[PDB]
């Protein structure tokens, strides 16, 4: 079981744990398939310079990449889809927003997402972004 608190405490100390968690980065799984990015770690709210590289090289060096780890998901709707992303309440916003077909989720841009879904959270953002696979 991987926990942000443990990982963070290892690479450094329990100081940004709250930030990440509250920023959606409460589950290490958020960086299981796609290691954290400079823009993300920087968008959160780090103390000061000298830590960015640490988290980057660390989260990037994290030996969690394997060949057998090629499992994916095949949902039928926004519901089951988000269900595989540690999210369910989103189903409401997504639905009322007009998201019925997965394809539709791939017909929007960043701004459109933060403007429609109104997520405004790196965690949930990266999670869904990775789940869909825009780029």
UniProtKB/Swiss-Prot annotation:
Expression across tissues: Highly expressed in marrow from patients with pre-B ALL associated with the t(1;19) translocation. Strongly expressed in brain and testis. Expressed in fetal brain. Isoform 4 is highly expressed in brain (at protein level). Isoform 6 is expressed in brain and several cancer cell lines.
Motif (Nuclear localization signal) on chain: 124-127
Subunit structure, as described in the record: Isoform 3 interacts with DLG4. Interacts with EPHA8. Isoform 2 interacts with COIL. Isoform 4 interacts with APP and EPHA8. Isoform 6 interacts with EPHA8.
Modified residues (Phosphotyrosine): 90
Posttranslational modification: Isoform 3 nuclear translocation requires an NMDAR-dependent proteolytic cleavage.
Induction cue: Transcriptionally up-regulated in t(1:19) pre-B cell acute lymphocytic leukemia by the chimeric TCF3-PBX1. Not expressed in pre-B cell that lack this translocation.
Compartments where located: Cytoplasm
Protein name listed in UniProt: Ankyrin repeat and sterile alpha motif domain-containing protein 1B
Annotated SAM domain residues: 1-65, 73-135
Role of this protein: Isoform 2 may participate in the regulation of nucleoplasmic coilin protein interactions in neuronal and transformed cells. Isoform 3 can regulate global protein synthesis by altering nucleolar numbers.
């Amino acid at each position: 079981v991987q926990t942000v608190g443990q990982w963070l405490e290892s690479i450094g100390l329990p100081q940004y744990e709250n930030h990440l968690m509250a920023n959606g980065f409460d589950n290490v799984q958020a960086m299981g398939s796609n290691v954290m990015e400079d823009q993300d770690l920087l968008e959160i709210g780090i103390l000061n310079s000298g830590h960015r590289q640490r988290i980057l090289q660390a989260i990037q060096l994290l030996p969690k990449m394997r060949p057998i780890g090629h499992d994916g998901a095949h949902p039928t709707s926004v519901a089951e889809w988000l269900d595989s992303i540690e999210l369910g309440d989103y189903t409401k916003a997504f639905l009322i927003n007009g998201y019925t077909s997965m394809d539709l989720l791939k017909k929007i841009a960043e701004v459109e997402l933060i403007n429609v879904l109104k997520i405004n959270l790196i965690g949930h953002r990266k999670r869904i972004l990775a789940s869909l696979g825009d780029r």
